[PDB]
Amino acid sequence: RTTRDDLINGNSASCADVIFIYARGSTETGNLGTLGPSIASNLESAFGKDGVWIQGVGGAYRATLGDNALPRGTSSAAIREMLGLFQQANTKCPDATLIAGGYSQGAALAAASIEDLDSAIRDKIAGTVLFGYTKNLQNRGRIPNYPADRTKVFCKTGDLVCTGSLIVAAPHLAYGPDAEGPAPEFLIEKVRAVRGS
């Protein structure tokens, strides 16, 4: 439903070509929340069910409302969890192309993790999509240490978290259509650009 642990459960003897690591929003269920499942089905349609592994950030990432107030928009424990997943992906499947994403607090988490990530593994992340990026204004629409061309931010007009606040307004809950259309198309394009064709 809203939980996928393809990377943790996957056999390294039969690695997928693409590994997608996703962080849900504050308070969301499973490890994929509301938007993750939509991105996943599109990726599965493009690469095949066996061509892509979908991994939500679970474990220590509780997606607590209060953690939004911490320095980087999320907890150090959650950042560690996501760094560990990127590391696990590289260790199990060194030839796999990575892609990432996050919504709300999850977007701040994805940004922090990528910032701290070993540059050699970071280079393998072909593209990252961020929805309702809570650090959009603060980071000037960027993920620290990561190129602009591999970044796609979805921030709606009226979504106050994209404008330096932490107030949740209706536009913050309107990313469903983006997750099922433009977001996966961007990720698929970025995977093909790095892998070639």
Side-chain angles (χ1 to χ4, degrees):
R1 185 57 263 162
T2 47
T3 299
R4 287 292 286 273
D5 283 299
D6 298 357
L7 173 59
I8 293 173
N9 293 334
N11 281 87
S12 77
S14 52
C15 282
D17 288 325
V18 185
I19 298 177
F20 180 59
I21 301 171
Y22 178 84
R24 73 194 187 279
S26 301
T27 267
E28 294 201 310
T29 60
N31 61 189
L32 296 184
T34 57
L35 309 181
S38 296
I39 302 173
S41 53
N42 275 282
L43 299 179
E44 287 175 20
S45 296
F47 303 121
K49 225 300 204 306
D50 272 28
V52 65
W53 281 354
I54 306 297
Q55 176 66 234
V57 183
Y61 180 39
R62 321 267 55 126
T64 284
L65 265 317
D67 290 349
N68 283 286
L70 287 172
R72 308 162 80 189
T74 192
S75 76
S76 179
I79 296 169
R80 265 117 226 255
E81 182 71 42
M82 193 164 189
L83 278 171
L85 287 174
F86 280 122
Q87 284 155 19
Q88 282 177 52
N90 194 61
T91 294
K92 273 195 181 177
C93 306
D95 293 313
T97 293
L98 304 177
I99 39 171
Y103 166 50
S104 204
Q105 182 178 160
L109 174 58
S113 294
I114 291 174
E115 170 176 19
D116 290 359
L117 225 207
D118 174 344
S119 62
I121 307 174
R122 194 194 298 127
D123 291 331
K124 299 182 172 184
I125 308 172
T128 302
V129 293
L130 302 178
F131 305 93
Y133 183 27
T134 60
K135 294 300 175 179
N136 181 244
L137 181 64
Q138 296 87 339
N139 289 342
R140 324 237 88 74
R142 298 291 298 274
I143 288 177
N145 299 333
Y146 192 65
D149 66 287
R150 297 184 177 200
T151 308
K152 166 76 88 153
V153 177
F154 290 95
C155 260
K156 279 172 163 34
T157 303
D159 185 353
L160 302 187
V161 316
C162 293
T163 245
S165 156
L166 271 183
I167 298 171
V168 171
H172 191 57
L173 285 38
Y175 297 105
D178 288 323
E180 65 188 4
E185 291 179 14
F186 169 82
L187 295 173
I188 294 167
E189 184 186 287
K190 296 299 163 176
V191 169
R192 293 171 177 165
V194 301
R195 293 191 85 76
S197 316

